[PDB]
Amino acid sequence: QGKIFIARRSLLDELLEVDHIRTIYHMFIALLILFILSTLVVDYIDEGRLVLEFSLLSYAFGKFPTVVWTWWIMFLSTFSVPYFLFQHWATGYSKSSHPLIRSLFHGFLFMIFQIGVLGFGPTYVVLAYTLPPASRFIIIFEQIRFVMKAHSFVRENVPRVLNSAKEKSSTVPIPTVNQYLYFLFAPTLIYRDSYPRNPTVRWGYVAMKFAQVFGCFFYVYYIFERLCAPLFRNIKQEPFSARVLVLCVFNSILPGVLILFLTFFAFLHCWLNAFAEMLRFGDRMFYKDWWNSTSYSNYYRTWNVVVHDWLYYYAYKDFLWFFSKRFKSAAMLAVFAVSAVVHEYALAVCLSFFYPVLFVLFMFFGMAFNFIVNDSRKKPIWNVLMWTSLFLGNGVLLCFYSQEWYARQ
C-alpha cells in the first residue's frame, strides 16, 4: 500500500524530441518573439523612446523584501516546529508516561501551530501591509506548500512509531534533520526516507529549464498586457449585459487557453524538473497524459499527481479509513469541498474581494463532471466534450475575475 517510487523520466521531456512536438515548442517561441516585437513597436510609436522597464511588474511585484522575510520566518517555523514536536516523541511510547493524554496534547500543539503560524501569519502580512495582487500569490502558494509538507511529515511518520511501540526493547525510528530538510525542497509530498535518485547532476539541464521558466513568465506577462489589457483596462461605458458579456467571455478564451498551457509547462513540468535535476530526484512522474483522457476520468489524477496523491492518500483514503469502508459519496464531496475551499480562499486573499463563482463552478460542475460521466467511457467524442468544457470554464473564469478586479478601481 501507499505510493511506490520508480526511477522514471518525465513524459513531456522524452516526448519533446519526437520531431513533431518540438515544432509546437518552436511555434510558441515564434509567437513569443512576435508578441515582443508587436509590444515594443506599439510602445515606441505611442511614447518617445522604447520602454526600458516593463512598469507592470514593478506594481505587480511591489514590496518584495517583506515577501522575502515573511517567507524566511515561515520556512524557519515549518522546519523547526514540526520536527522539534516530533523529536519530543523520542521518548514517545517507550516509557509511556500515561498515553492518550500526551498524544492528543502534542496533537493539539501541532494544530495550534498549523493554524496560529500558517493561518494568520501569511494572511496577516498580505492583508495588513497592503501588498499587490501578483506578489500575494507567492506567500499563499508557499503557505499551502509548507502546511502540506508538515501534515505529510506527521501523518506518515506516526504509523512507524505507533507500530514499533508494540515491540518491547527496540530502537525507535526517528527521521534525521538532513533527510527531512531534503524532503522540504523535494518536488513530491509522500515519503521521508530513501527516494529513488539519479547518478549525477547535469547542470546544463537545469540551466535550460530555468531559462524556459523565465521565458514562460515573460510570455504570461505579455499575455495579460496584450490579450487582457486592451478590453479590460479601457471599458467603462453603457454598463449593460446585452451581448457584450458573451463576446467578453468569447474573446477571453484564447488568452485563457495559453494561460492554462503556460501555467502547466512553466510551473508544473519545467520548474519541478529543474529542482528534480538540481537536487537529486528520480521519480519525475508528477503529471500524466491528460491530453487524450476521457473527461475527468483521468484528468483529475493526471493533471497534478503530486497534489492529487496528497489528496488521495491523506484526505480521501484517511477519510475512508476514519469511516472504515463503503461510501463513495460524502467522502468524495469532502475532498472536492476542501479542494475548492483551498482554491477560492487563495484567490480571495490576493485580490481582497470575494465573489467566488469559482466555488460554484468547482462545486456544481466538478461533481457533474465525475458522477454522471464515469471512468469506463471509451468513445473519442468525450475528449472533445472535455476540451469544450475546459476551454469554456477557464474562459469564463479569466473573464469574470479580471472584470471584477478592474471594476473595483
Ligand X SMILES: CC(C)CCC[C@@H](C)[C@H]1CC[C@H]2[C@@H]3CC=C4C[C@@H](O)CC[C@]4(C)[C@H]3CC[C@]12C
Ligand Y SMILES: CC(C)c1cccc(C(C)C)c1NC(=O)NCC1(c2ccc(N(C)C)cc2)CCCC1
Q: Which residues are catalytic?
A: 343
Contact criterion met (CB below 8 Å) for 323 and 347 = no
Query: Is 291 an interacting residue with respect to a second copy (CB under 8 A)?
Result: yes
Q: Alpha carbon of 57 to those of 14, 217, 331, 383, 398: distances in Å?
A: 34, 11, 42, 37, 19
Cβ-Cβ contacts under 8 Å for 43 (sequence gap 6 or more): 50, 51
What is the Cα–Cα distance from 105 to 89, expressed in whole angstroms?
12
Q: Which of 252, 191, 196 has the alpha carbon at shortest distance from 224? A: 252
Longest dimension (CA), the chain: 81
Q: 339 among the known binding-site residues?
A: yes
Task: Report 1-20 residues binding ligand X (CB under 6 A).
Answer: 20
Sketch the per residue contact string, 379 through 408, with a second copy: x for CB under 8 A, - otherwise: -x--xxxxxx--xx----------------
Residue 337 near which of ligand Y, ligand X, ligand 3VV, none (CB within 5-8 Å, type-dependent): none
Contact criterion met (CB below 8 Å) for 189 and 307 = yes
Cβ-Cβ contacts under 8 Å for 338 (sequence gap 6 or more): 311, 315
CB of 104 or CB of 367, closer to ligand Y: 367
Q: Kindly indicate which of the ranges 15-23, 108-116, 129-137, 164-172 contains the residues binding a second copy, using the contact rule CB under 8 A.
A: 15-23
Query: Is 35 an interacting residue with respect to ligand X (CB under 6 A)?
Result: no
Measured at the alpha carbon of residue 181, what is the angle toward residues 179 and 183, in degrees to the nearest 5? 70
Residue 81 near which of a second copy, ligand Y, ligand 3VV, none (CB within 5-8 Å, type-dependent): none
Sketch the per residue contact string, 275 through 304, with ligand COA: x for CB under 6 A, - otherwise: -------------------------xx---
Query: How does 199-212 read in b/e, with b if 16+ C-beta sit within 10 Å?
Result: eeeeeeebeebeeb
282: which DSSP letter?
-
Query: Is 268 an interacting residue with respect to ligand COA (CB under 6 A)?
Result: no
Quick one: which of 42, 90, 357, 368 contacts a second copy (CB under 8 A)?
42
What is the binding site for ligand X (CB under 6 A)?
20-21, 23-25, 28-29, 32, 212, 215-216, 219, 261, 265, 291
List interacting residues with ligand COA (CB under 6 A): 300-301, 308, 311-312, 316, 335-336, 339, 362, 366, 375
User: Which residue positions form the known binding site for an acyl-CoA?
Assistant: 298, 301, 304, 308, 316, 328, 339
